[PDB]
Amino acid sequence: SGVLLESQTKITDGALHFDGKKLNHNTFENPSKSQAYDYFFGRNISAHGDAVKPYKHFVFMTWYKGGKEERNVMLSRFNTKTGVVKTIQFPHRHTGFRGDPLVGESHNTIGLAVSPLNGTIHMVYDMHAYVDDDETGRFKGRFVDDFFRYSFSVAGAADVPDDEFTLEQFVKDTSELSQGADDYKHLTMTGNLQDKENFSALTYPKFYTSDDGELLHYMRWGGNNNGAYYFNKYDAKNQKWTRFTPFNHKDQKTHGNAYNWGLYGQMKYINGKLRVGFQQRSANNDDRFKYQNGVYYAYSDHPDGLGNWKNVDGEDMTWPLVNSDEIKIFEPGDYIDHTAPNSVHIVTGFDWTVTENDDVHFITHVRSTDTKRSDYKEVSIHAFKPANAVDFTITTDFTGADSIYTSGDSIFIIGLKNGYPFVEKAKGGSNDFEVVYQQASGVKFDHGTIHIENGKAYYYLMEKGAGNALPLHLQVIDLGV
Ligand SMILES: [Ca+2]
Ligand SMILES: [Ca+2]
Numbered sequence: 009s010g011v012l013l014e015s016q017t018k019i020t021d022g023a024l025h026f027d028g029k030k031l032n033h034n035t036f037e038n039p040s041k042s043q044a045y046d047y048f049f050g051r052n053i054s055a056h057g058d059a060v061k062p063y064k065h066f067v068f069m070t071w072y073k074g075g076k077e078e079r080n081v082m083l084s085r086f087n088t089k090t091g092v093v094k095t096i097q098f099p100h101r102h103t104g105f106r107g108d109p110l111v112g113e114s115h116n117t118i119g120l121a122v123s124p125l126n127g128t129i130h131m132v133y134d135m136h137a138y139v140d141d142d143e144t145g146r147f148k149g150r151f152v153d154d155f156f157r158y159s160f161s162v163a164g165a166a167d168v169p170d171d172e173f174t175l176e177q178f179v180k181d182t183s184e185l186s187q188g189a190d191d192y193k194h195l196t197m198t199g200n201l202q203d204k205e206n207f208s209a210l211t212y213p214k215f216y217t218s219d220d221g222e223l224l225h226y227m228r229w230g231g232n233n234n235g236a237y238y239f240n241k242y243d244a245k246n247q248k249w250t251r252f253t254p255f256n257h258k259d260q261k262t263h264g265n266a267y268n269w270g271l272y273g274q275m276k277y278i279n280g281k282l283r284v285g286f287q288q289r290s291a292n293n294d295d296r297f298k299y300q301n302g303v304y305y306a307y308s309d310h311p312d313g314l315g316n317w318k319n320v321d322g323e324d325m326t327w328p329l330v331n332s333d334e335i336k337i338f339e340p341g342d343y344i345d346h347t348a349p350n351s352v353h354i355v356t357g358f359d360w361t362v363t364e365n366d367d368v369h370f371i372t373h374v375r376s377t378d379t380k381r382s383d384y385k386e387v388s389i390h391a392f393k394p395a396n397a398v399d400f401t402i403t404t405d406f407t408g409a410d411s412i413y414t415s416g417d418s419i420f421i422i423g424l425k426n427g428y429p430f431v432e433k434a435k436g437g438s439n440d441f442e443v444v445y446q447q448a449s450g451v452k453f454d455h456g457t458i459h460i461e462n463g464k465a466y467y468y469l470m471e472k473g474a475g476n477a478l479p480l481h482l483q484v485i486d487l488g489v
Contacts, residue, residue: 011444371412
């Protein structure tokens with residue numbers, strides 16, 4: 009298969025991880041003050057999200073400093089030629105669920121990008137739909153002037169010698185809203201506070217690099233059954249970003265739709281175009297879908313995504329989008345025979361990709377909402393349209409996965425099995441997966457996050473262990489393509 013482990017490097021002994029108990033609506037205001045670190049959603053916050061990016065012979069990695077009492081934003085640069093790892097500790101510390109640092113908040117990843125055009129570094133972090141509000145608000149005024157958190161460096165910072173890779177490469181907030189001399193968090197990416205409302209209430213920072221070396225970024229507004237993707241672009245010449253522009257309208261019921269809907273999926277820049285693939289969550293609570301339904305896909309012929317959107321058949325899409333029917337590919341709910349209200353459960357197991365040969369691939373998963381019914385049904389689905397085919401092949405002869413990747417002529421499933429990375433590989437446009445790599449010895453891992461580039465998988469991993477300060481490792485896996 010050609011798949012092999014090319015390197016494994018320890019990046020730190022102590023990154024943040026939530027080792028306490030899971031809280032809920034009833035218990036989150038009384039978190040543990042002892043050594044263990046309670047959390048509200050999941051345990052993962054380091055080596056999680058868009059936190060690993062190669063750049064020339066470097067790999068940059070973000071993480072939160074471990075120890076429940078530490079939690080600083082960290083940036084590490086790994087020189088793959090010399091083996092040196094140099095780390096910058098930022099003043100901002102994870103602020104936790106709704107701003108209480110005693111409750112870990114796994115949405116609040118540290119997204120990362122490096123511009124190949126001027127060597128600037130960009131980080132957006134510790135965000136979950138925050139806004140300006142006051143003591144009576146959901147956030148109790150804890151994010152005033154600080155609801156969007158962006159740090160960035162001067163030009164060329166990515167390439168400085170190790171001795172010079174320091175917090176001094178990054179630009180302080182010196183605006184009228186600066187919180188002090190250690191404030192490295194900018195409220196907008198445009199450099200203009202007049203835009204701050206355009207940066208309000210966002211979650212999930214994710215960066216891409218265009219084929220021309222331009223950085224793209226998108227985030228999600230809202231969530232649940234009323235959400236939207238917003239994207240913007242980096243102007244390297246002026247060292248600032250554009251305002252966010254929507255893929256779809258929020259509040260769709262006020263823009264001409266029968267219902268509001270949310271989006272569960274990803275925008276991705278693939279094959280030289282901004283594209284999107286998702287399952288919707290309609291606000292309709294009377295149809296058969298308790299949560300998500302459908303598979304949806306579109307791509308833009310505009311270099312920055314500003315219009316000229318099309319569905320998989322090349323038909324023009326209303327933009328910003330209002331009615332998801334325009335770009336629907338198929339209905340995974342059709343693969344289970346329940347029809348009563350809320351009887352069909354679709355949440356986990358969705359992802360999509362497009363290969364360099366233009367094969368289109370979706371994976372998803374569907375089960376009965378009622379796990380106790382005697383006619384319980386559960387299926388994983390692989391839908392793919394080979395490069396030259398007219399229609400999608402849709403099959404349940406598939407074991408399911410949380411992600412799908414592509415490089416060269418192949419698609420990949422990459423994850424952990426019993427704590428060890430594995431790789432499954434298939435030809436693009438096919439369902440012929442085979443396990444081609446499986447680590448079998450060494451320290452085991454709790455979780456990780458993957459970036460594909462250069463025909464390699466950069467697998468940024470947290471080692472298994474007790475406590476809330478655990479080691480991080482970078483594995484570089486050659487995918488044999
Ligand atoms: Ca600030
Ligand atoms: Ca529904």
